Design a protein around this ligand. Structure first.
Ligand SMILES: [Ca+2]
Length: 356
């Protein structure tokens, strides 16, 4: 009954993305730690979709490059998903794709390279790579967080997928875990929903959770970052971990991620349907580029503002949980901000209006 797949244009129509804006005059940076894209996959994608193929440029960081491995189950499914979702929705934007070694060094460098790129000058950075907070060294965490801090002062929005393994984030240690870089207070963390869209509008939108075998959105309470003052009115709960400690609530926003209501894309030259919170940072990156186009000034660091905007700028997700480690429903969605979906799915035209 409910659709089993969407085009990005369908998802954007449900989230009322602001029309007649295509990201012209903006650059979206996408960070990549493996695989690549091929011109054949993208051209087929955008032709079948029916949108003018956007300009995409590969950038080599620390010696890595654009190199498809041909396995749609590998990193190409990430690189091509990121370009196809964001390019479908901001096809007037220029896309800058930074390829780096999958190392602490390569991840950081790819980000700092993007933020400061004097030639492509992206106003938005989209990230769909990560790892549980404690899987990172404290120094790597610090370098990265300072890059995000830098991004904010430069007027560059940084978005990042919150993770595809629920509230335990792929760690079995009796503890709940959030993913980094989504946990950074300077990053717009992107969570995952199952969307059911009907007639261009949302018929239902619930937490993405297909069990331990099909994935769940990341979400929870940071153990590294304290609760930011802009989250003081969001009713963030304490971590569900034994000392009940206060912390940055993840994520900030959420959108369609459930493979079961997935995106129709072309990976390694073949059609398929995939999801993952990996699709949602591109999705909203496109949204931000459209807003930048209309306001004529980069929104830059957006998190604090979101939380003080009127609640009706967001579609509230209230049903579901992102627990795949057990049946205790940690964490669960509910009225207002929750640790599965944040403030909810943005309603693009209202968000823009509130920023005018
Ligand atoms: Ca909610």
């Amino acid at each position: 009954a409910a659709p089993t797949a969407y085009t990005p244009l369908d998802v954007a129509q449900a989230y009322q993305f602001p029309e007649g804006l295509d990201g012209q005059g903006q650059c979206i940076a996408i960070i990549e730690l493996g695989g690549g894209y091929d011109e054949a996959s993208l051209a087929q994608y955008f032709a079948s979709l029916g949108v003018p193929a956007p300009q995409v440029v590969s950038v080599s960081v620390d010696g890595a490059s654009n190199q498809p491995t041909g396995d749609p189950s590998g990193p190409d499914g990430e690189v091509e998903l990121d370009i196809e979702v964001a390019g479908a929705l901001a096809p007037g934007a220029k896309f800058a794709v930074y390829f780096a070694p999958n190392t602490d060094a390569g991840f950081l460098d790819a980000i700092t390279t993007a933020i400061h790129d004097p030639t492509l000058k992206p106003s938005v950075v989209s990230i769909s790579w990560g790892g549980p907070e404690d899987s990172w060294t404290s120094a790597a965490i610090a370098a990265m967080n300072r890059a995000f801090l830098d991004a904010a002062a430069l007027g560059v929005t940084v978005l990042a997928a919150a993770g595809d393994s629920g509230s335990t984030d792929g760690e079995q240690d009796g503890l709940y875990h959030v993913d980094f870089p989504a946990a950074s207070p300077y990053v717009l963390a992107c969570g995952g929903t199952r969307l059911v869209a009907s007639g261009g509008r949302i018929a239902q939108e619930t937490v993405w959770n297909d069990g331990p075998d099909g994935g769940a959105t990341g979400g929870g309470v940071s153990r590294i970052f304290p609760l930011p003052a802009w989250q003081e009115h969001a009713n963030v709960p304490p971590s569900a971990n034994p000392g009940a400690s206060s912390g940055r609530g993840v994520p900030d926003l959420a959108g369609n991620a459930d493979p079961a209501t997935g995106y129709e894309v072309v990976i390694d030259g073949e059609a398929t349907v995939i999801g993952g919170t990996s699709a949602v940072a591109p999705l909203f990156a496109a949204l931000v580029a459209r807003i930048n186009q209309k306001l004529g000034k980069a929104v830059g660091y957006l998190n604090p503002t979101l939380y003080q905007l009127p609640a009706d700028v967001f579609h509230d997700i209230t049903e579901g949980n992102n627990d795949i480690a057990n049946r205790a429903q940690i964490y669960q969605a509910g009225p207002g901000w929750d640790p599965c979906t944040g403030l909810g799915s943005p309603i693009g035209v209202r968000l823009l209006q509130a920023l005018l």
